Assembly symmetry: C4
Homo-oligomer: 226 residues x 4
């Protein structure tokens, strides 16, 4: 029964997550153009995405669904069994949540209109192929810490891990951000794209996190043999 509140636990959560995130960012560009946000001061933006996850993680399901992206899950699968690993649901959740996440935004935020957007949070690029690697190295540590944190002992009473992970993820963004918006999570993309998505990129983004996370568990496995 749990596996189901579990999904919703994330269906919901993730939504809340991406809304805030997309909240603050857009939060900053808005009253009449040229005053503070000609081009918004990046860390707070990082902070929003950053801190967010750790809170939302400290609250939701614990040993089970807490996270909010596909890369983490597979990193997990990687072992001997898919007999119970129907984590593919988690992804569809993480995806559907994102859409009512971006959707609920346009609803309120509906006057943000110069050559108006609330833009593809990511694949925009005044770059070419560089965009690719950057994110793939970042999730590498995220997934890394995500599993590190887990080895012997499970969930908190001192709450370090979540605070940890959250700010860890934050790191991704400080950097992730400029070149092509923050990319450590699949869901974050669809929601943005749902309007007009022009880059073959935002998903070369996905395979990225996977692969970043691919060598991530591969390098975390040989660390010392399970």
């Amino acid at each position: 029964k749990l596996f189901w509140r579990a999904v919703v636990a994330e269906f919901l959560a993730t939504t809340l997550f991406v809304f805030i995130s997309i909240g603050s960012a857009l939060g900053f560009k808005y009253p009449v153009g040229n005053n503070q946000t000609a081009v918004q001061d990046n860390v707070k933006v990082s902070l929003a995405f950053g801190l967010s996850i750790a809170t939302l993680a400290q609250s939701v399901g614990h040993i089970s669904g807490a996270h909010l992206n596909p890369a983490v899950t597979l990193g997990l699968l990687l072992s001997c069994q898919i007999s119970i690993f129907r984590a593919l649901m988690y992804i569809i959740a993480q995806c559907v949540g994102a859409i009512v996440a971006t959707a609920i935004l346009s609803g309120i935020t509906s006057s943000l209109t110069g050559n108006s957007l609330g833009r593809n949070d990511l694949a925009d690029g005044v770059n070419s192929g560089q965009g690719l690697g950057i994110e793939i190295i970042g999730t590498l540590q995220l997934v890394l810490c995500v599993l590190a944190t887990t080895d012997r002992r499970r969930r908190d009473l001192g709450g370090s891990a979540p605070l940890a992970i959250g700010l860890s993820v934050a790191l991704g963004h400080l950097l992730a951000i400029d070149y092509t918006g923050c990319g450590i999570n699949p869901a974050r993309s669809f929601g943005s794209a749902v309007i007009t998505h022009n880059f073959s990129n935002h998903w070369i983004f996905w395979v990225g996190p996977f692969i970043g996370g691919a060598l991530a568990v591969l390098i975390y496995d040989f660390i010392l043999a399970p």
Copy 2:
């Protein structure tokens, strides 16, 4: 006897809280107009409100009154008994403290006068109905974490929760802020309004936190049955 230092514990605290908060914010707009604060760099502002609560929470009453807003309390009530739940006092406290909080400000801060104010920290709006939801989603996690943190085990010797909660609350603000100033707390409103409060808003603000927190404990209850 405790229930009473308890109230004062918060009467006082909260006051200290909102003063700092209103301190820094106003802190930034002031020497002669056009120099740094044409429109103040938002996160530190978030930081003040943000960090503040966690300190003030780590210090005051522990199992009992530590918090500083009405939404948290009801989230608590929600169970089977008001036989001892005269938490309505806590609210009047949280309200009275706020007034000597804003009051003590005008006393010192008394030269901040262009078309001078120390403004309705919140309901200002270059928006319409959007303002409503935004805050209602934010307190959702605050109250969420506030109760999550509490389930089995009570108060700290490793002090995570408070540090947690504080920065959690901080999240609310990073975002909460731009559209219509930070709104996760009833008290924060009166104190600001005490001068000239023009919006039917700042309290549609209250019912908001409640309702955000309303579905908040409702969703935290079905999480797994008490």
Copy 3:
């Protein structure tokens, strides 16, 4: 023997502390005038003073001298005995350290010269009597948390308190800063003044922290009877 490394432990530490602090701040105003620092972005400045203390506290003497200001110490005295409480040394230390702290600065930092200074970090004021209270409310929580943290259990293996206290102190600054530079510590003043100190203020600053801390332990005592 310990009481002595203890003092030096702080003699030294505090020095290191105030140097960094005075480091970053001055750090920001310097290459040729009008480019980034017309008037330096305040939180990092807060961060330096802020984070600093928590590190330096996590490292130095533990049950004993860790702190770096006079207000904390007296808050401590307040009990029944000065038979062993010759904490007045600690102050002279905290004072002497500050001078080689500011001194060692002028040595390196020696080209920072427009109408050049590395100014009275604090009492400057485009204000009058407001400056007074502001800091007195801030140390109130610092001292508060400083003692809260201590009640039943002593020093860390999970290291929360220091991280706590540090960022707690940080709070003071975010706000403390603008009106008249950050004021939660006696030492910080002398070192700055050692050159040309014009305000009857910077020490009405001292009596402030004391008194802030005075009612601080008085309110922390009645909290629940020792």
Copy 4:
């Protein structure tokens, strides 16, 4: 067998570290000149280097190789035996990693070209001999905390230390930064220099950390006798 994944553990890690670090920094100066980054808002930059290490440390080898610089290691040696202390490898690692770290950068980041660089992250200087001391005082606490944290008890289940150390190191940067870029680590230098390194400085930088760390363990030893 461990001593070897150990080195790679750092060979790799450190690389990841310096890339992000050099990532964000460069991250900020780039789209067409005069828009936000005329001269980049320093703390986030601090954050990247800052938070980074704590994550990467929370994930890699634990009792053993976690760190990412030469100063920490010797501080360690300092005791009675080099029979097993072939930590000189660690340095060559920390050095080689840095080069594929800066290298992999130029590969992606390859359009950042005004009078283009991705500059000597450090020894630049509109100063003379001041540059020298500044960093030597900073690592003093880093190494300090690095060893403090270690005394009686080893590695985390509450994860404080790493979070600690990371932000501790962050402190170095907030300040370290302006005068001559952040300097608390040997590796960080080579990678930058690998192109065109003009200062006798960046290594007077090394002897610095050592010596900062030299008196660092000397002062941490007399603290209380091993």
